[PDB]
Design a protein around this ligand. Structure first.
Ligand code: VK3
Ligand code: VK3
Lengths: 103, 103
């Protein structure tokens, strides 16, 4: 029902983006098992050499589906997400989070 | 009376941001003594590991208070500011300057 697209902007260079991705690798199976989660995928740009593509190498884009806002909010308080946030605090600069419905 | 917030964007890496901060260290006491100056503080992001914070490592945020636009404009013509501008010309990319009043 809700679709979340979250862009996580990482610090340039020094394998910061990979550090974050590695933290997601630890957590994604767990998140998929959370109540109300119907998708949770960290994505990165893939250079297709087409003129219409825009790329941001220092970013990870999450695509997620949650049954409700309550389920998303619960997600954010889980220990795996608190552990994730602590683990990536020196790697992440900001997040831009959209909550979307069918248009 | 006027509050100025100026974001100074610096060149990535190569201690450019520190070079600029060092130039501010030279000038801040002088600026505070300028007529009509009631605050002049170069600030940087401080990573608090909270999800709601946005950080830009290649930026310095000035928070200032000036008694009037004339006082600010005079500030910009002082020798310490002309010397500052010359000193940082290879370190700074741009500035975004807001002049604010109580809402
Ligand atoms: C604040 C915040 C932190 C996250 O780690 C996070 C992870 C996945 C989806 C959304 C979010 C979010 O809104
Ligand atoms: C153009 C310009 C240059 C500065 O160096 C500067 C320094 C402090 C406050 C404002 C400014 C400003 O508007």
């Amino acid at each position: 029902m809700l679709t979340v697209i979250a862009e996580i902007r990482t610090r340039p260079g020094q394998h910061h983006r990979q550090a974050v991705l590695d933290q997601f690798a630890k957590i994604v199976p767990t998140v998929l098992k959370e109540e109300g989660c119907h998708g949770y995928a960290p994505m990165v740009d893939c250079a297709a050499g087409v003129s219409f593509q825009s790329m941001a190498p220092d970013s990870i884009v999450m695509i997620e589906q949650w049954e409700s806002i309550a389920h998303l909010e619960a997600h954010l308080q889980t220990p795996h997400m608190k552990a994730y946030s602590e683990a990536v605090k020196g790697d992440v600069l900001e997040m831009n989070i959209r909550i979307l419905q069918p248009g």
